[PDB]
Design a protein around this ligand. Structure first.
Ligand code: ZN
Lengths: 98, 175, 1111, 195, 49, 99, 63, 99
């Protein structure tokens, strides 16, 4: 689970609601992808920074934090976590069905 | 009302507010009407006159009205590959500029070492090389026990002497 | 020669032809004229079937009209579709990226009967794209060609099957109409007969017949002989017409409550109403001809009929009973047999006009629905046809067809032959046709009906082998889309001069003789039994007093390209196919010398390809230059022909045109005035004549490799002009407007030397890889500046450098000169796509020379790359001292069965040397049948060898025997075509004579300059971090599953791990391996590929709990 | 055939409740990128449309049940949501597939796992590879058995980092930037070290 | 099947129109079957490995 | 070497600005702000862009100082309420010519 | 199950593996290739990958 | 001869106005010129013609110390508006040397 190419086994199985919620870093509840004017991801949308990580490296939603010194501290105004934008390829979301 | 509002809200992949959807549809409708009337496609100036709005805004609306295309649609004449196989990665590391950057870092460190320790430190904490933050004149003054005016003078002198021919020639190629 | 300016080309043909080759662009031109409704097509229809001359547009307008509302008191109609003058000339449209079109107007009439109102208007239906004089369409400045396709004609088809469980013969029939619901009948393993319709595997024929209003007594009195389905009727277990309708409704329409009238109305609407089911005119004609229903009536009521249905059932039952002849009540007698689905009597040809008509029909159906809704909604007595009709669906449909459709393809113009073969080509793909994966061996096969209609030699060799072919050189398209070929007739045993065009339907009901039959020059056959084709495609010997038809001429079975292959009958089918396919890939050289040995098809192909200027009116020539030619006609007026020069074709090849006339000579109508890219003196010339020896040499020609002299590089014998265009546009962005300017931030001064004040490279400036063509800069403002970048900026004292230079640079891997620049800007009234305020295109040309790795070819499929270019001194040379120009291996000829190339070599040497048959005491026996004016040929003469009426082996042997010396008294080539060669390296004479001659060699479009590729590190894809593919990007080779299997078989694991992890996916691995490889340390350990993580996340997204356990 | 799955469920710790879903996950956005390609036009990953459809149906259903709607309307909305989920997972498995512009079916999740062009075969077993090239083949009869003739431009491009490091070591260039510049311009002092 | 009337001539002496037609029949059949066989063999060896 | 657009003519060497041809004095920060505006005529500059370039890199204050400077420059050179120093909300300021 | 899914019948194999909670030891050649670790054949065997080389004592003394 | 120059052209793929001949085919015709020079350095010779006529290798003036030997060979054909003005530079050498 540490990605060190030392894998004793690889397991598959049915995923439950609890497992899906454990995987999810947040809940997406709006069918909006990108703002048509500012070209930035919308809040709580399919590309929400708060859920999936920052779009740009070491940057919050508006720019309150823009330095590498703010390591792993979420912005109070937005709620996004200041980390490498590559985490956008790893964080997973979920939706709650009626 | 409900059907039109829902269409404006959820029709496009990129959400467009109803205030802009209405003007987009109105512009398209009267543009087609003008084309039918005239026999030729109406010019942007004519469309702007009909809108009673500026041609710049007309063109902005026209470019806003565009919709995205599928990245997985077949691009070849036959079915061989998808459009997603033809698009590069802008944010990907090029693996050569990184080497150039680290060598530039080493060379800049060496060049700063050639100068005096006081001036090298002043430049380092002024431009934020040890850490991310570039410190202020008051900060460097309070950490070095020197007047801010004197620190400004020594920084200017350090910059002028760092503009010196050999250092400039050495750093020129890294650009 | 039928051409006033035709150069003399003595022919070896023994038999004359009755009729000349028709216009090779007829298949497109006549179809488009029919679609338009031009007076020329009006006259053609008047002279041939004046019963109903109606164009495609008129037909679709009449079919759509009159649109009716629910009330019926008001209606709309369309009539009189007229055209207008074209928007702009073809050259201007091509230059300014416009569409060659013409406005279309329709007289719309709105009638109101409740009170009485007539509203007549001339509604502008849109800008209809036009077809040029060469059968091509100009769309956005590109030459597009619509290839005719082959589709099964709608109608009724019978088939026979063996169950293989009881070995019982079963018969089925399918009625398939265009744009309708299927009809199907069959006999099952038992005696039951099935009518499975719209995939409903029930309702035998009896319930359908009862629903059709037929009583049981009527059924038994009409269809009485059919005991099998009479027993089926006795086992119908469904009595009553109303019960039959109820069953049919409750099956085909589940979920709805059946009613008394709904069943009848649905049964009618399914088939007998044209609004939901209608065979085309061709389909109705085919059904009528098959069932013998109407023979002296015009085509109307395109929908199906109950009489047609019952006739089909009767045909099926009679065929199952073993009958061979049926007379339908009220119809003529017709034979009873199964129908071949691949027979050319049923495989109709949808042409350009038909495809355009179908697209117009779709657009006008959408328009009709829209206009019906609008005219229902809007108020009455205040409506106008102008306010009613909306042309958006029609224009959208025509654009959606003419662009982005696989039946409308780029007109490949590597050479005039390539263009002419792209036209008059029959495809089998696209909408309404079978797919490549869907295709089968049976359809890919060759049918005996293909003779004279589709050439069986010319076809692509790729995965679509057999799905694409070419029209026969004599073929024609009938008014119903069926391909027909001309054939002469024989009466009493004498062949007449009458010519009648026969479709494949009638050719089975006749006995066609052979083209090169031993005619007696009077009409009779000197030999009683001749070889003929019978009804079922069989070939047999039949007495001369029995045949009823004869082939017009040889080469009728062959296409236009393959007809340019000399000694074709001496070449195997596969190699001839290869040569015919490769004929269209030859690039145009700088001179394009006419071939020494050829056929008569070259002149006609060059004339009909439209790449050579011709004199439209006879007259004298006033003045001639390199750009324009002025012709002073007879009747006072004068004409000026503008001649294009170095115009880039579709595939980046020059299209230079050169005058071939003088300043005072007179020219007649149809005479060639200027030759094009691959034309010499007005005839097609795709290659050069080279002195060739066919012996092996040091292994440099091993395995199909080719050796050439350096004099071909020196004298520019094989050089081609290749022009490449580059485009860049300035477009408004959210941060402002990018501008083209020579002021590029942070760039040197030397690199800006070739840029003028405008920022565009000066015309004629030599350019190489990595240079800048257009100086364009974009507003980027500023981004995240790292501290090191801030330090660099503040130490070098750079200014704001507010903009980022995304200037146009030449692609990596080519160079050359600059021809011309076209600049488009919206500030100069030029129309551009929205958002773009400037467009610049730069033309770069390279005088590419022949080199190793380039692909040369002959006319007989003897392709080959260039192994080595030898110095002129180090090559074999004859006793006269002339070195051989090209050397080919001798092991490739006997294995591939292409002796025709050696025959061509011998004949070419004979033509080059010249000959004179010594008629001291009569002509020799072998020269008895040889035509006159061929007994004496001057050196470097040109001869024409028809593909099948060619030069015989004895005649060529005699010509080789009489081979008059070159300069002094010396016969270099002996009787059997060989000669003694001196080795250019050791100098000793070669121990045995080798064959030498003159062969036609062409340079194909497979230049190594366009195929060399290498990559160290380039771009990567987004979803997965694999490198991109193709020379458009920087590339990256595909290491596939087979390569992985080979790697595993070798047992080498480390190289496979590297090729998978640190070269493709692992980003940190790539960065670290590059850093190690530059710093000198060893390669670090590979990590986890990114594709595996992507797969893991994809599996997790599918609600699958997949994880990795370390212990 | 029933026991072969019933006993499999019984033996393991998983629960047959896994068949139904109360919540579904969303793939990371970088795995479904939306990219502004050259010319201002945008490109979506064809999965965002399915996700948007599912979100819209779920939101409408929850709004309907909160507001109070007839049971037939609620059932129709639930059926639509179920169909959207099935389309997202296996498009075209049941009924006609959901199609976008151009009458082409949208590709689903499993649609990028099966087939020759799927991820497993087209991106995992096989791969595109750097430091590689291709070109036409000619005969090399003068070479030995263990030798092949490589084009000099092709070899220069393939061995670009090697030759760059070597020429930097030989003091022909002051730094890697200058080495890259002279390699791209193909200076005469490159072939000597390339050999 | 085999056509009862064969080709009496050879490529050295040249063929006649119908002779070339039947030869083309056979050649096209072979050229299609080899193209199918390539993919079939590829599938077979993939399964085998 | 002068930077000019329409009615504004700035000479860095002599360090003066001309608006229809009379002397007019500006505070320095405003002067370099005008220099940044004129050198990028017709191209909008973002607020963080201006703050990072024309103000010091480590400006820890609040943004509206740039809007105050822009108001100063406007009331100094752009007399009327239709201006040559255009503002685009959320994107920043620019010096084009009205169309 | 990884090898089976990469081979053929991907959906069926994945469904069966998920139902049975099957586990892959990752000891196979195809799965090793997929995950990017050294294949268990040829130079991937332990007896070949875990060899240790060293200069001989006489050679080191003479060096 | 290694390099040429026509006043009215810029590259080999243009056309001189007034002459029926093309630039490329004029080059190819000039390829068949035989000369004999006595000076190793590059030497320039000139060819100027105007009016309707067939310009051959006899209308080219060679500077002293070099010799042309095939003056009857055809070069180009002009018209009333035709006007040809070319300069040929010639050097010694051996074998074949590309452009
Ligand atoms: Zn924030």
């Amino acid at each position: 689970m540490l990605d060190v190419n030392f894998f004793d086994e690889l397991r598959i199985g049915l995923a439950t609601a609890e497992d899906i919620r454990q995987w999810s870093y947040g809940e997406v509840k709006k069918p909006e992808t990108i703002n048509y004017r500012t070209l930035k991801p919308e809040k709580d949308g399919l590309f929400c920074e708060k859920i999936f990580g920052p779009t740009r490296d070491w940057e919050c939603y508006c720019g309150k934090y823009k330095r590498v010194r703010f390591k792993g501290i979420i912005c109070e105004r937005c709620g996004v976590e200041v980390t490498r934008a590559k985490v956008r390829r790893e964080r997973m979301g979920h939706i709650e069905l009626a | 009302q409900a059907i039109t509002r829902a269409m404006a809200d959820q029709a496009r992949t990129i959400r467009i507010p109803v205030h802009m959807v209405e003007v987009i549809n109105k512009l398209g409708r009267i543009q087609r009407e003008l084309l039918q009337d005239l026999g030729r496609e109406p010019t942007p100036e004519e469309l702007a006159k009909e809108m009673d709005i500026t041609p710049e805004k007309v063109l902005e609306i026209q470019q806003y009205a565009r919709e995205p295309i599928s990245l997985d649609q077949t691009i070849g004449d036959e079915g061989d590959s998808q459009l997603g196989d033809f698009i590069e990665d802008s944010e990907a590391v090029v693996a050569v500029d990184a080497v150039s950057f680290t060598l530039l870092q080493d060379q800049l460190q060496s060049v700063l070492d050639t100068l005096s320790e006081r001036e090298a430190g002043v430049v380092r904490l002024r431009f934020g090389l040890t850490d991310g933050q570039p410190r202020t004149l008051d900060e460097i003054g309070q950490v070095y026990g020197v007047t801010r005016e004197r620190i400004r003078q020594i920084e200017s002198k350090t910059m002028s002497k760092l503009r010196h021919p050999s250092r400039s020639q050495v750093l020129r190629d890294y650009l | 020669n039928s051409v006033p300016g035709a150069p003399n080309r003595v022919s070896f043909a023994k038999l004359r032809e009755p009729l000349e080759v028709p216009g090779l662009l007829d298949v497109q031109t006549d179809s488009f004229e029919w679609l338009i409704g031009s007076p020329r097509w009006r006259e053609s229809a008047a002279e041939r079937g004046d019963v109903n001359p109606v164009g495609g547009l008129e037909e679709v307008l009449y079919e759509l009209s009159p649109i009716e509302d629910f009330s019926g008191s008001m209606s709309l109609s369309f009539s009189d579709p007229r055209f207008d003058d074209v928007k702009a000339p073809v050259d201007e449209c091509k230059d300014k990226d416009m569409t060659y079109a013409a406005p279309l107007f329709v007289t719309a009439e709105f009638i109101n009967n409740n009170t009485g109102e007539i509203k007549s208007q001339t509604v502008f239906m849109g800008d209809f794209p036009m077809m040029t004089e060469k059968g091509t369409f100009i769309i956005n400045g590109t030459e597009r060609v619509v290839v005719s396709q082959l589709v099964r004609s709608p109608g009724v088809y019978f088939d026979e099957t063996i169950d293989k469980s009881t070995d019982k013969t079963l018969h089925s029939v399918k009625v398939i109409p265009s744009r309708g619901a299927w009809l199907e009948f069959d006999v099952d393993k038992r005696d039951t007969v099935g009518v499975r319709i719209d995939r409903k595997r029930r309702q035998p024929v009896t319930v359908l017949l009862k629903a059709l209003g037929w009583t049981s007594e009527q059924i038994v009195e009409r269809f009485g002989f059919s005991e099998i389905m009479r027993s089926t009727l006795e086992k119908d277990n469904t009595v009553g017409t109303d019960e039959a309708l109820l069953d049919i409704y409750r099956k085909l329409r589940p979920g709805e409550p059946p009613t008394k009238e709904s069943a009848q109305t649905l049964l009618e609407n399914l088939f007998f109403k044209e609004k939901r089911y209608d065979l085309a005119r061709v389909g109705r004609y085919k059904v009528n001809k098959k069932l013998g229903l109407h023979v002296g009536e015009p085509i109307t009521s395109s929908t199906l009929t109950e009489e047609d249905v019952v006739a089909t059932i009767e045909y099926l039952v009679r065929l199952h009973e073993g009958q061979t002849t049926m007379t339908v009540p009220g119809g003529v007698e017709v034979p009873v047999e199964t129908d071949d689905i691949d027979h050319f009597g049923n495989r109709r040809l949808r042409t350009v006009g038909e495809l355009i008509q179908n697209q117009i029909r779709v657009g006008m159906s959408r328009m009709e629905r829209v206009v019906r809704e609008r005219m229902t909604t809007q108020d009455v007595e205040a409506i106008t046809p102008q306010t009613l009709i909306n042309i958006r669906p029609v224009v959208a449909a025509i654009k959606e067809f003419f662009g982005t459709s696989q039946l409308s393809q780029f007109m490949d113009q590597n050479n005039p032959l390539s263009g002419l073969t792209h036209k008059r080509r029959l495809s089998a793909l696209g909408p309404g046709g079978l797919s490549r994966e869907r295709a089968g061996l049976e359809v890919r096969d060759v049918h005996p009906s293909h003779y004279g209609r589709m050439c069986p030699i010319e076809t692509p060799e790729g995965p679509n082998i057999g799905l694409i072919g070419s029209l026969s050189v004599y073929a024609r398209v009938n008014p119903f889309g069926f391909i027909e070929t001309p054939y002469r007739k024989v009466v009493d045993g004498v062949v007449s001069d009458e010519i009648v065009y026969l479709t494949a339907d009638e050719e089975d009901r006749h006995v066609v003789a052979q083209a090169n039959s031993p005619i007696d020059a009077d009409g009779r056959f000197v030999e009683p039994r001749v070889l003929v084709r019978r009804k079922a495609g069989e070939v047999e010997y039949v007495p001369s007093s029995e045949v009823d038809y004869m082939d017009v001429s040889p080469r009728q079975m062959v296409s236009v390209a393959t007809a340019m292959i000399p000694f074709l009958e001496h070449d195997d089918a596969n190699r001839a196919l290869m040569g015919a396919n490769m004929q269209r890939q030859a690039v145009p050289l700088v001179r394009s010398e006419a071939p020494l040995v050829g056929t008569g098809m070259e002149l006609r192909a060059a004339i009909d390809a439209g790449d050579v200027v011709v004199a439209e009116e006879s007259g004298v020539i006033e003045e001639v230059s390199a750009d324009y030619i002025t012709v002073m006609h007879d009747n006072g007026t004068r004409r000026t022909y503008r001649m294009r020069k170095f115009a880039r074709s579709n595939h980046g090849t020059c299209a230079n045109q050169c005058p071939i006339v003088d300043a005072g000579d007179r020219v007649e109508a149809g005479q060639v005035i200027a030759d094009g890219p691959c034309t010499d003196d007005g005839e097609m010339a795709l290659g050069k004549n080279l002195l060739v020896a066919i012996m092996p040499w040091e292994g440099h020609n091993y395995e199909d490799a080719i050796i050439l002299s350096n004099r071909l590089v020196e004298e520019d014998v094989l050089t081609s002009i290749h022009i490449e265009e580059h485009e860049i546009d300035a477009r408004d962005t959210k941060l402002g407007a990018e501008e083209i300017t020579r002021d590029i931030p942070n760039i040197s001064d030397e690199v800006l030397a070739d840029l003028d004040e405008r920022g565009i490279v000066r015309i004629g400036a030599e350019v190489r890889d990595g240079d800048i063509l257009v100086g364009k800069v974009t507003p980027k403002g500023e981004t995240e500046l790292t501290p090191e970048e801030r330090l660099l900026r503040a130490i070098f004292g750079e200014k704001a450098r507010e903009v980022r230079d995304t200037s146009l640079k030449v692609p990596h891997g080519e160079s050359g000169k600059v021809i011309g620049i076209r600049v488009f800007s919206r500030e100069d009234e030029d129309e551009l796509p929205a958002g773009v305020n400037e467009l610049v295109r730069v033309y770069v040309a390279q005088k590419r020379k022949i080199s190793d790795g380039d692909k040369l070819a002959g006319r007989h499929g003897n392709k080959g790359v260039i192994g080595k270019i030898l110095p002129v001194e180090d090559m074999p040379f004859l006793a006269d001292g002339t070195p051989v120009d090209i050397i080919l291996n001798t092991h490739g000829v006997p294995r591939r069965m292409n002796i025709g190339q050696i025959l061509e070599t011998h004949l070419g040497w004979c033509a080059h040397s010249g000959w004179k048959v010594d008629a001291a005491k009569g002509v020799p026996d072998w020269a008895a049948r040889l035509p006159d004016e061929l007994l004496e040929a001057q050196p470097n003469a040109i001869v024409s060898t028809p593909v099948f009426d060619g030069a015989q082996e004895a005649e060529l042997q005699g010509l080789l025997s009489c081979t008059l010396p070159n300069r002094d008294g010396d016969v270099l080539v002996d009787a059997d075509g060989k000669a003694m060669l001196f080795d250019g390296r050791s100098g000793e004479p070669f121990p045995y004579p080798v064959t030498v001659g003159y062969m036609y060699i062409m340079k194909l479009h497979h230049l190594v300059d366009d195929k060399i590729h290498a990559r160290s590190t380039g771009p990567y894809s987004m979803i997965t971090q694999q490198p991109l593919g193709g020379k458009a990007q920087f590339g990256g080779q595909r290491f596939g599953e087979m390569e992985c299997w080979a790697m595993q078989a070798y047992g080498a694991a480390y190289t496979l791990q590297e090729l998978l992890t640190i070269k493709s996916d692992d980003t940190v691995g790539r960065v670290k391996v590059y850093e190690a490889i530059v710093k000198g340390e060893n390669i670090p350990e590979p990590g986890i590929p990114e594709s595996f993580k992507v797969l893991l996340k994809e599996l997790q997204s599918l609600c699958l709990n997949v994880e990795v356990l370390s212990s | 055939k029933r026991l072969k799955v019933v006993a499999a469920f019984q033996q393991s710790g998983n629960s047959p409740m896994g068949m139904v879903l109360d919540a579904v996950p969303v793939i990371p956005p970088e795995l479904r990128p939306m990219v502004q390609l050259d010319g201002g036009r945008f490109a979506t990953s064809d999965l965002n449309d399915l996700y948007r459809r599912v979100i819209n149906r779920n939101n409408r259903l929850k709004r309907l049940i909160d507001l109070g709607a007839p049971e037939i309307i609620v059932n129709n909305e639930k059926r639509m949501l179920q169909e959207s989920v099935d389309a997202l997972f296996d498009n075209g498995r049941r009924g006609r597939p959901v199609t976008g512009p151009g009458n082409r079916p949208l590709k689903s999740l499993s649609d990028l796992l099966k087939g020759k062009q799927g991820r497993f075969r087209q991106n995992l077993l096989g791969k595109r590879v750097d430091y590689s090239g291709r070109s036409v083949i000619v005969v090399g009869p003068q070479l030995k058995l263990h030798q092949c003739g490589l084009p000099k431009l092709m070899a220069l491009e393939l061995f670009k980092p090697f030759v760059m490091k070597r020429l930097v070591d030989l003091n022909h260039a002051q730094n890697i930037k200058s080495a890259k510049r002279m390699v791209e311009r193909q200076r005469p002092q490159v072939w000597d070290v390339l050999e | 099947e085999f056509i009862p009337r064969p080709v009496k001539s050879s490529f050295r002496e040249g063929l006649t129109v119908l002779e070339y037609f039947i030869n083309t029949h056979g050649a096209r059949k072979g050229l299609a079957d080899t193209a199918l066989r390539t993919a079939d063999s590829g599938y077979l060896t993939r399964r085998l490995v | 070497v002068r930077l000019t657009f329409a009615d504004i003519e700035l000479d860095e060497e002599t360090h003066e600005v001309w608006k229809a041809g009379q002397p007019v004095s500006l505070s320095p920060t405003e002067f370099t702000l005008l220099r940044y505006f004129v050198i990028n005529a017709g191209t909008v500059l973002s607020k963080p862009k201006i703050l990072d370039h024309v103000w010091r890199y480590d400006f820890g204050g609040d943004v509206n100082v740039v809007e105050s400077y822009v108001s100063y420059l406007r009331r100094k050179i752009d007399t009327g309420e239709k201006r040559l120093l255009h503002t685009l909300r959320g994107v920043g300021y620019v010096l084009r010519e009205p169309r | 199950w990884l090898s089976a899914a990469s081979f053929q019948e991907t959906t069926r194999v994945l469904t069966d593996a998920a139902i049975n909670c099957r586990s892959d030891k990752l000891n196979g050649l195809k799965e090793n290739v997929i995950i990017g670790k050294l294949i268990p054949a040829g130079t991937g065997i332990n007896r070949y990958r875990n060899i240790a080389v060293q200069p001989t004592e006489e050679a080191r003394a003479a060096a | 001869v290694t390099s040429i120059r026509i006043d009215g052209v810029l590259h080999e793929f243009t056309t001189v106005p007034g002459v029926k001949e093309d630039v490329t085919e004029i080059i190819l015709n000039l390829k068949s010129l035989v000369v004999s020079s006595e000076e190793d350095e590059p030497v320039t010779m000139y060819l100027r013609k105007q009016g309707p006529g067939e310009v051959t290798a006899g209308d080219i003036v060679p500077p002293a110390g070099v010799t042309v030997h095939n003056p009857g060979m055809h070069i180009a054909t002009l018209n009333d508006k035709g006007k040809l003005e070319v300069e040929l530079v010639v050097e010694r050498g051996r074998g074949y040397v590309p452009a």
